[PDB]
Design a protein around this ligand. Structure first.
Ligand SMILES: OC[C@H]1O[C@](CO)(O[C@H]2O[C@H](CO)[C@@H](O)[C@H](O)[C@H]2O)[C@@H](O)[C@@H]1O
Ligand SMILES: CC(=O)O[C@@H]1C[C@]2(C)[C@@]3(CO)CCC(C)=C[C@H]3O[C@H]1[C@@]21CO1
Length: 511
């Protein structure tokens, strides 16, 4: 009956045994899960995660690799990974409420488990890249007429050989496309799981796997990441009017951003697309250095990228004098979890801050303006950005806030599925260094010998809403930016143009 933002709610989100054996558990999803889990969107793969890893065969000449035996090895690794992190076999259902239900069932038998793992690993002798396959799958989705949600995870192994029993040559590449329903993970969890598989598969290269100790299915249930609410350092019962007002500030900015000036888009819905700019290690190191020197401690290339996003937008437009750039921006919420949970959490764990930049005219610069003017503008924007974040990040309730406001947003989106009209303010997503989660090599564990070099990583998300989302990460000291967009709403040329503008501004910051 009250008009107030609904409260959390913890008991609602806990794991519940659904039958007498204890083998099946379920929970009502929470926070950002409820956004990605929105039924008509999840059924159509909105926000599905794709991780494209290009790998090179650097194994001893005496190591024999084929797509068939790699499939076999990754199946074994995936069974090990399901035991460690059962998120990879959770499934989704809905009733009449907005939030999805997440279910885990322990395999009914070891045979059943192997059928499962077999069904998640695919191969193709093909010259297509991982991201060519992504495009193929998204182009196909349409006509296929099925609104089945994606599996928690599946793998596609590609290599340009004639057949699946052709030895993969020295120095040849194997591409892996990982594909995940975003419901079961965030970008941190999914990357950590990719890293786990690259670790676990190392046990199976060069070998008698049928003789290894049987997996005692059932014993992995305790391995599911615990419910996020119950995992916070903060007792959420202790919250009062400060928490309510801050949540209100967020939901107000959310609606303000949805209704605000931004990039013009054309209405419609067609295919998810991505444009990528891989900066060199040399360029990226230079930019990181220029951030350290010019701005110093507590500033990062992520702040710089957000600043460049803003400058590129202002340079693109030909805004009211009093416009404020306001942008809800997501943050990894793990620091708000208890220490012995926080570094081993695979489920969605996200919250958010509101980036605010006033005085936009004063930072409006062209690529042709004096370098020092551009640097100044970038500096001023970075300082505004860092300051904005601090106001959210310094707050001990920030993760609880994220859960509560994303519950509201799922409900808001359920009633208004496309919340932008005419224009949409670009969104920034900051992921950090992939080395935290993924190894540079897959090694034969028994020997320590390198078998496959992990040469490239590209984190691609399905976009079916009409805003640009810009994602930054890093691998082997090279920063990568990509922009996801739906091709009903924007052209490739115009998103390429905008990404190039962003990159050009960041390059301009170098010493
Ligand atoms: O010249 C260094 C710089 O430019 C690169 C060269 O590889 O250019 C990339 O830019 C576009 C983005 O539109 C990519 O799609 C293209 O494949 C790349 O050549 C980039 O890596 C370096 O930063
Ligand atoms: C500003 C904010 O917090 O947004 C939310 C965080 C996020 C997890 C996600 C960021 O990772 C999903 C991927 C994309 C494209 C955009 C973002 O949209 C909302 C989300 C789905 O729940």
């Amino acid at each position: 009956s009250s008009s107030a933002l609904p409260p959390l709610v913890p008991a609602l989100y806990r794991w519940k045994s659904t039958g007498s054996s204890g083998r099946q558990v379920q929970r009502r999803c929470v926070g950002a899960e409820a956004i990605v889990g929105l039924e008509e969107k999840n059924r159509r793969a909105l926000y599905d995660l794709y991780i494209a890893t290009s790998l090179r065969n650097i194994a001893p000449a005496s190591t024999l690799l084929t797509l068939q035996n790699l499939k076999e090895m990754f199946e074994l690794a995936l069974l090990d990974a399901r035991f460690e992190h059962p998120e990879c076999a959770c499934t989704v259902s809905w009733d009449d409420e907005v939030p999805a239900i997440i279910t885990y069932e322990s395999p009914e038998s070891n045979e059943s488990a192997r059928d499962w793992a077999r069904g998640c690993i695919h191969v193709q002798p093909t010259a297509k890249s991982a991201l060519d396959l992504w495009s193929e799958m998204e182009e196909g989705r349409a006509a296929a007429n099925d609104n089945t949600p994606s599996k928690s995870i599946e793998l596609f192994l590609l290599s340009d050989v004639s057949t699946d029993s052709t030895p993969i040559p020295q120095d040849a590449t194997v591409e892996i496309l990982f594909h995940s329903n975003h419901l079961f993970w965030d970008g941190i969890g999914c990357r950590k799981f990719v890293g786990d598989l690259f670790r676990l598969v190392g046990s199976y290269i060069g070998r008698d796997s049928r003789e290894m100790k049987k997996i005692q299915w059932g014993q992995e249930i305790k391995n599911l990441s615990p419910p996020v609410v119950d995992s916070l350092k903060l007792d959420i019962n202790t919250l009062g009017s400060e928490f309510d007002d801050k949540c209100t500030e967020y939901t107000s900015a959310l609606v303000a951003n949805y209704k605000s000036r931004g990039m013009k888009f054309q209405p419609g819905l067609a295919l998810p697309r991505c444009v990528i700019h891989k900066l060199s290690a040399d360029e990226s190191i230079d930019i990181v250095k220029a951030v350290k020197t010019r701005l110093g401690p507590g500033f990062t290339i992520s702040h710089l990228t957000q600043a460049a996003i803003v400058l590129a937008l202002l340079d693109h437009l030909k805004l009211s004098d009093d416009e404020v750039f306001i942008s809800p921006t997501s943050v990894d919420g793990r620091r708000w979890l208890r220490e012995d949970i926080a570094s081993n959490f695979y489920a969605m764990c996200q919250t958010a801050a509101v980036v605010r930049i006033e005085n936009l005219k004063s930072i409006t610069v062209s690529h042709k303006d004096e370098k020092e003017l551009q640097v100044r503008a970038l500096e001023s924007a970075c300082r505004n950005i860092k300051k904005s974040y601090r106001q959210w990040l310094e707050n001990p309730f920030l993760q609880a806030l994220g859960l509560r406001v994303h519950n509201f947003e799922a409900s808001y989106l359920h009633a208004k599925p496309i919340p932008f009209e005419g224009e949409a303010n670009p969104l920034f997503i900051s992921d950090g260094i992939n080395e935290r989660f993924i190894p540079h090599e897959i090694k034969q564990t028994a020997t320590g010998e390198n078998v496959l070099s992990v040469e490239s990583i590209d984190f691609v998300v399905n976009q079916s809403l009409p805003y640009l989302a810009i994602r930054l990460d890093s691998w082997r000291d090279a920063s990568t930016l990509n922009i996801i967009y739906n091709d009903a709403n924007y052209t490739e040329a115009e998103v390429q143009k905008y990404l190039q503008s962003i990159v050009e501004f960041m390059l301009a910051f170098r010493l």
